[PDB]
Each structure stands twice: as C-alpha cells, then as structure tokens.
Amino acid sequence: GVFNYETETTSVIPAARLFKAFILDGDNLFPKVAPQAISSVENIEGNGGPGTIKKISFPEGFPFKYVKDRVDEVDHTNFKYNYSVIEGGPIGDTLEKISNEIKIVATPDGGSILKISNKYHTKGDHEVKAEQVKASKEMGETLLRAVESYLLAHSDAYN
C-alpha cells in the first residue's frame, strides 16, 4: 500500500536558480558541496529526463550504502520534479519503491518554498517507521542548506 509524507521547507534562493542547481544539477553538486551526506552520484542510463537511472552512494558509516533512483518527470514550467527510489537501501521485500515529488514556489521576498511529498509503496502488512521518514527529512534539509550556502557563495553559478 501507499504511505504519504508531505512537508514544506523554505529556502533563501530564488525558485528558478534553486530548481536549476538543487534539482537539475544535484548530481554534480551534492557530492561536491555535501560529501559528508552523499559520496557520489552515478548516471547509469539516460540523459536526465524521464527514465534516467542514477546510483546515489552514501558516505561510509551511513545506515544505507546506496540507492538507485529513477527520474519520473521534470517540469521546468512549474519547477516540479518527480523521482523514485527503486533499488538499494530500504528497498526490498517490505518496500517496493519510494515515489517523491518536489515543487519549488517563488516567494515575494526573493526566496522560495519547497513542497515535498514522499510516497512509500510497501509490500504486505509492513508499515513505514517514523525513523525512516525523519531520516529522509533531515538529509533533505542537510543537502538544501549545503547547496544554499554554495549558491550564496558562488554568485555566477546557475544563473
């Protein structure tokens, strides 16, 4: 069945720039700016659009070694990005996939709001523990803050 987690966070980066950096170029950026959170991102197949498969490796000592994610949909117009964790880490005999969606909305003060949904698709009568969900949120925030600090410090990047 499906368990749906939604949350919102704020960013000081304008929506379009954050979408370009955080969402579209997360592959180069995350391991560069947050090597303590993500060790590497490997493009396995595809050119970044729907169906593209990436292997995200975590630093030694993390609960999970890696996941493979699949890009589902990339909407530049509405700054919406849909992708699924499809293998590795928590995925297996109790969890089929995690379907995620982020929408980035502009705020009048020049910042943005990130609206996030994580949909856990389980197998059988296994439920999703809050510990799994909190972990996802805190890494989300860790990557956002590290990317933020990098976009603030490198003004000529992703304009």
Curated annotation (Swiss-Prot):
SUPFAM superfamilies: Bet v1-like. Brassinolide binds at K54, Y81, Y83, N100. One of its GO terms (cellular component) is cytoplasm. Keywords: Allergen, Cytoplasm, Pathogenesis-related protein, Plant defense. One of its GO terms (molecular function) is protein phosphatase inhibitor activity. PROSITE patterns: PATHOGENESIS_BETVI. InterPro entries: Bet_v_I/MLP (IPR000916), Bet_v_I_allergen (IPR024949), Plant_def-hormone_signal (IPR050279), START-like_dom_sf (IPR023393). CDD domains: Bet_v1-like. It is found in: Cytoplasm. It comes from the Eukaryota. One of its GO terms (biological process) is defense response. Belongs to the BetVI family. May be a general steroid carrier protein. PANTHER family: OS08G0374000 PROTEIN-RELATED (PTHR31213), STRESS-INDUCED PROTEIN SAM22 (PTHR31213:SF55). This is Major pollen allergen Bet v 1-A. It comes from Betula pendula. The lineage of its organism: Eukaryota, Viridiplantae, Streptophyta, Embryophyta, Tracheophyta.
